[PDB]
Amino acid sequence: NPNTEENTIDSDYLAASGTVEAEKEITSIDDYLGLVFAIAYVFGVFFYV
């Protein structure tokens, strides 16, 4: 159930909040999305990721 399991709720809405930022017109989200994941493990040390 994607509407009662908060684990998929958090990930689905979080992923949708990121792919929608393609409207900011940075570049192909299909390209730099992999860099976002790597960049998170640089600054995510602050949050213990």
Partner: protein
């Protein structure tokens, strides 16, 4: 507050409620489509009586 995570719960709770009333909301959408369909079938009922009237 940083209510970002809360907004994700509230939206899920509203969607969960819509799924609970899926049958009621879709049946109301068809009640209008059936009213339109029945309205177009009124013409065939009129022509069937033309032979009896003639």
């Amino acid at each position: 507050p940083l209510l970002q995570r809360f907004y994700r719960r509230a939206a899920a709770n509203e969607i969960f409620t819509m799924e609970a009333f899926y049958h009621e909301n879709i049946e109301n959408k068809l009640r209008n489509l059936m009213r339109i369909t029945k309205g177009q079938l009124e013409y065939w009922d009129i022509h069937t009586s033309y032979g009896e009237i003639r």
